[PDB]
Design a protein around this ligand. Structure first.
Ligand SMILES: COc1cc(OC)c(S(=O)(=O)N2c3ccccc3C[C@H]2C)cc1NC(C)=O
Ligand SMILES: COc1cc(OC)c(S(=O)(=O)N2c3ccccc3C[C@H]2C)cc1NC(C)=O
Ligand SMILES: COc1cc(OC)c(S(=O)(=O)N2c3ccccc3C[C@H]2C)cc1NC(C)=O
Lengths: 222, 222, 222
């Protein structure tokens, strides 16, 4: 079985080259299902396409990516070592390297997802960004929102999962915990480090911060 | 040396196929040491097995994984781009993608380790979960424990390393800092965002949270 | 184009072997630009070298790494699935696995960067460590500094980027948020979980922590 199915991977790689896809190495490509694509698609080494996948025009997929049952709009750039499962990307999204989209990730036009970021059942609005070290689960995020490094939707209480809704034009400071269910109004700002347990008004700053203090001459243990 | 040792990798890949291992691509497989395996093992592209490794039955290892000196029980699923070194997994553990187990990681039956999670000298009990963006070092974690996204054992003070002990049936809220040495009693709940500096009683909620407030009409700088 | 340029990758791999580089698999190596190297360099599977790259002696590069326009000093160890772009590493740095250095990352002698750590326009001093789940952007970090898991430079306010400066001999507790622009004096200690909004004095402990409390007999929802 193994050698035979490996041969069928060469066939596919070859047919893809003939149909105008740029494969960096046809010997390091795997298609387990069906791929539909537009023009000028570029696929790097060690990519694996699973299930039923569709790529628009000029999509670029970097080394090591795994894309399963997903829809990827024109001009998207998927950077190295990014895993995508049952997600939809609109045109001109940039994700990765080291991004992980679980089923139900919906990215709107121009959205950005950076390194060590995970999405599941979450929509990221147009031009919105989640650049670092973040989990967004069971969330609606509006357009032109900035999701600071370290932000986490607390969506699961051990019994049920609950929905977070963030409005347009929101700035989420780093290391914010969004305790679901919670809604953050359009234009609001969440201070870095905030534990958000209550709805935030439009154009409001939400904060839950102890003033910084200092003790002089502190010796660490030797 | 290089071409010769590459040939010896083909030999191994071939012998593994003959012995009933399912290798997705024998040309993208590396065994640097010895592998013992049960029946129905499936190994994807670009896996590297190092040192002395043993896999039970029906173990599935996804693309890009690196497994060194480890013991992996029956039915485990190791997802893509996961690195495992000197770890033991009981039956039916699921780890990755992008998990990183350092020496001394001990996972008990059915345990789960998600993306961007690191373990070192830490035991994860039966059916317990650490799904996201977490470091567990020098820790004992009991059975049926949930470790929320963003949790970190503070195990090292710049001089020494100290042990964290979490009991059975504990819910660790997201972004908890466990300041070692510390013990959290069976059934307890740690509120999201808590800095745990003192032992937590059985069935207790521990919390260290400033009430959320809000200022109206907050303008961000242009 | 594809098959022809693939052939030129074999040529390069072959020339590199002749020039004394240890390539684990010449069929899984890609050079897109120019590589200069010293003696005893070891390069594992699925590495991609981009732009103009220089490696000192005895550099070891693990599986899946992507290195572009970078300078890597003698004795460095780059662990698996690490992405490096426009960075300089001094001698004896260890980075990865799963590290991500963006342009302007400058690592001084013996520095360490661990899993799920991102640097951009940031200097890491001699013997300094950032082992886990951290973003350092637009930062100066001195020598013999420990950057705890979960630390984040808050460098961007939605309008501008600002600089964080950490002195020599500083201990940054886990999950610290550094709100830029901010300076932390030589020898200081930041308590785990602190939101640093004000400059920290030399040899001072900075802290912003609510005392832990506990409520007895807390039932989670069923
Ligand atoms: C420098 O970047 C920041 C500064 C800052 O306050 C000075 C805050 S904040 O959240 O404390 N905050 C914010 C956030 C955005 C704009 C202005 C301010 C003032 C203040 C209330 C956040 C960041 N950046 C990130 C990514 O968190
Ligand atoms: C919705 O998910 C959560 C809710 C929640 O409080 C309403 C808390 S909590 O930690 O603030 N907390 C918890 C945690 C579990 C169950 C019930 C409560 C009430 C409260 C004291 C935590 C989460 N989830 C995660 C992963 O952190
Ligand atoms: C056990 O490791 C720690 C202990 C600790 O306090 C007991 C603190 S702390 O930041 O709360 N803190 C520190 C930090 C370093 C040395 C001594 C102390 C005492 C106290 C003020 C931090 C860590 N480790 C990490 C990685 O954060």
């Amino acid at each position: 079985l193994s050698r035979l199915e490996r041969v069928y991977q060469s066939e596919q790689a070859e047919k893809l080259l003939l149909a105008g896809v740029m494969l960096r190495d046809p010997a390091r490509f795997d298609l387990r299902g069906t791929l539909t694509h537009g023009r000028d698609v570029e696929i790097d080494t060690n990519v694996i396409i699973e299930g039923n996948v569709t790529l628009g025009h000029r999509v670029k997929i970097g080394t090591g990516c795994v894309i399963k049952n997903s829809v990827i709009g024109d001009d998207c750039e998927i950077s190295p070592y990014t895993v995508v499962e049952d997600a939809n990307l609109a045109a001109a999204c940039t994700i990765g390297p080291f991004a992980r989209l679980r089923p139900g990730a919906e990215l709107l036009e121009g959205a950005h997802v950076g390194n060590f970021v995970e999405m599941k059942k979450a929509r990221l609005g147009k031009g919105s960004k989640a650049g670092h070290l973040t989990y967004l689960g069971d969330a609606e995020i509006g357009d032109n929102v900035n999701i600071g490094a370290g932000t986490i939707t607390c969506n699961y209480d051990g019994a049920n999962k609950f929905k977070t809704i963030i409005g347009d034009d929101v700035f989420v400071g780093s290391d914010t915990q969004l305790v679901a269910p919670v809604t953050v109004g359009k234009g609001a700002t969440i201070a870095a480090g905030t534990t958000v347990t209550r709805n935030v008004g439009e154009n409001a700053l939400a904060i839950s911060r102890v003033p910084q203090t200092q003790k002089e001459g502190w010796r660490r243990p030797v």
